[PDB]
């Protein structure tokens, strides 16, 4: 079909131990146009793909109350790939982490880009 020029690639999805920390990165490539909103989502077994953290136009960050103080996200427009600092990995926090990039196009067009969710395995 018709697809956008930007692609998302999530880095991370490794194997960490209970209590450990991991950093995931979302690589946006395709267009030099300033990406408008970036966020991290999680797909957990038994749950729906939940919002973990979002960053708006001004880097307006919103995190789930359950990730406050443990998860931190950072966004550069194009010199860096968006960071997700995850600390205190719990055994049952093993899930897929997805990246969402939202771009405000032209005047009134909005697109949600989803990447390839990588699964983080926590060793207990």
Full 3-state SS string of 62-122:
EECCCCCCCEEEECCCCCCCEEEEECCCCHHHCEEEEEEEEEEECCCEEEEEECCCEEEEE
With 0-12 CB in 10 A as exposed, 13-18 as middle and 19+ as buried, what is 70? middle
Q: How far is CA 30 from CA 48, 109, 111, 114, in A?
A: 29, 18, 14, 14
Quickly name the fold that domain 7-106+110-119 has. Answer: Immunoglobulin-like (2.60.40)
Question: What are the backbone angles phi and psi of residue 92, rounded to the nearest 5°?
Answer: -90, 10
Q: In what order do the strands lie in the sheet with 71-74?
A: 7-11, 22-29, 82-86, 71-74
Question: 6 is written with which tokens?
Answer: 């930007």
**Domain locations in the chain?**
7-106+110-119
Select from 83, 57, 79, 53 the least CA-distant residue to 68.
53
Q: Is the dihedral of CA 95, 12, 68, 102 positive or negative?
A: negative
| Rounded distance between C-alpha atoms, residue 44 and residue 67, angstroms | 14
């Amino acid at each position: 079909g018709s697809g956008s020029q930007v692609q998302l690639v999530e880095s991370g999805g490794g194997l960490v131990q209970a209590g450990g920390s991991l950093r995931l990165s979302c690589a946006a490539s395709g267009s030099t146009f300033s990406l408008h909103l970036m966020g991290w989502y999680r797909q957990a077994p038994g749950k729906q793909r939940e919002v973990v953290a979002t960053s708006g136009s001004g880097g307006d960050t919103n995190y789930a109350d359950s990730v406050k103080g443990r998860f931190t996200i950072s966004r550069d427009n194009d010199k860096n790939t968006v960071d997700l600092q995850m600390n205190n990995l719990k055994p049952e926090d093993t899930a897929d982490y997805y990246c969402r990039a939202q771009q405000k196009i032209g005047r009134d067009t909005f697109r949600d880009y989803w990447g390839q969710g990588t699964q983080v395995t926590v060793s207990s």
